[PDB]
Amino acid sequence: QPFIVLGQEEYGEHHSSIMHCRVDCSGRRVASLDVDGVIKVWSFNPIMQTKASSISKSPLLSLEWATKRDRLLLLGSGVGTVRLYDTEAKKNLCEININDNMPRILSLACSPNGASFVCSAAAPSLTMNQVPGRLLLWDTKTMKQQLQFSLDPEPIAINCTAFNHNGNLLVTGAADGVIRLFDMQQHECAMSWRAHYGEVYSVEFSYDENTVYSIGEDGKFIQWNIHKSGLKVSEYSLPSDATGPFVLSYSGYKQVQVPRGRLFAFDSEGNYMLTCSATGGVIYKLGDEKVLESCLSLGGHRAPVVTVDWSTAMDCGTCLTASMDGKIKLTTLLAH
């Protein structure tokens, strides 16, 4: 046991499958979004209580907490808008239209220093997700676009974004299965390589930032050498219920969810990784036998888990696991 489990609670205010659930930067609030466009904002320490609740008139695809103003939440729509929501004042500060032909705001990342954010904006899905997309850099102080990064070889939908600790690097994964790493000082692509057969769903810097981790449609979790483009450090086939597609089957009726939120999350120092499964969160130790072996199973879910988070605050771990029945389990972990 590398962790003791201090409790497992259920947040149940959503009645639809969860799309995203993320802990804020203070580590004390959750923002969660379901497929019916219900945004909920809630605390959990010492009990679960709801701070805000709103139906979006518009489809909502993405969610990102601000880094340097804890109470601000960025929301990306399916109608080409970025909304800035004040969780404390329970009102929208602004909603900016993206003056373009790319309505799907698939991914939002706020810079660590708080002066900037990035969003991906994609064309409509085809009657694949292998469609044109853009990557936009914004100024948080004006909430205006500054520039778009050209994507080679072609405009492509970007599914996932993450900054490094300082914010000078941004790693992205796209629907063409390619990872693109951007130098955010020079505003150019430092590095790119083919990462997955099919889509990249999540990307993350290792704690030490010598590697980035990725998970994608081919079912593989891969660790890449940030110093040498496309050189793998290690590669594992996760169980299929880590990357879906996620099915809840009734009389010939089923609900199907393709990955959209973050499929993996890490402890404070990046030694352990939480993933999805039919029946709850599954945690692995990083670092490297041939078959990656599971050290902890959080359980507690009676419908597929589709997205997860992991935050550490007051020296305690909080794991979120969110399933297709709309339930969010909040498990509390102590690192011995």
d(CA 168, CA 328): 33
Tokens of 79: 């109608």
Find the binder of ligand A1BBW among 142, 186, 249, 251 (CB under 6 A): 142
**In the complex, residue closest to ligand A1BBW by CB:** 114
- Name the segment binding ligand A1BBW (CB under 6 A); options: 123-131, 139-147, 257-265, 311-319: 139-147
Candidate residues 94, 128, 231, 334; the one interacting with ligand A1BBW per rule CB under 6 A: 94
Closest of 138, 210, 142, 198 to residue 171, by C-alpha: 210
Q: What share of the chain is helix, strand, coil (3-state, %, to 5)?
A: 0, 55, 45
Binding test (CB under 6 A) with ligand A1BBW, winner from 35, 72, 226, 328: 72
Select from 23, 60, 63, 66 the one that contacts ligand A1BBW (CB under 6 A).
Answer: 66
The answer to whether 122 touches 158, Cβ cutoff 8 Å, is yes
The verdict on 93 binding ligand A1BBW (CB under 6 A) reads yes
In angstroms, the CA 199 to CA 174 distance is 6
| 247 part of the interface to ligand A1BBW, by CB under 6 A | no
Contacts of 11 (CB under 8 A, 6+ apart): 30, 32, 42, 44, 48, 327, 328, 329, 330
Which of 32, 120, 140, 331 is in the footprint of ligand A1BBW by CB under 6 A? 140
Least distance CB 302 / ligand A1BBW (angstroms): 37
Among 2, 27, 114, 270, binds ligand A1BBW (CB under 6 A): 114
Question: What is the distance of C-alpha 198 from the center of its chain?
Answer: 18
- Residues at the site binding ligand A1BBW, with contacts judged by CB under 6 A: 66-69, 72, 84, 93-94, 110, 114, 117, 140-143
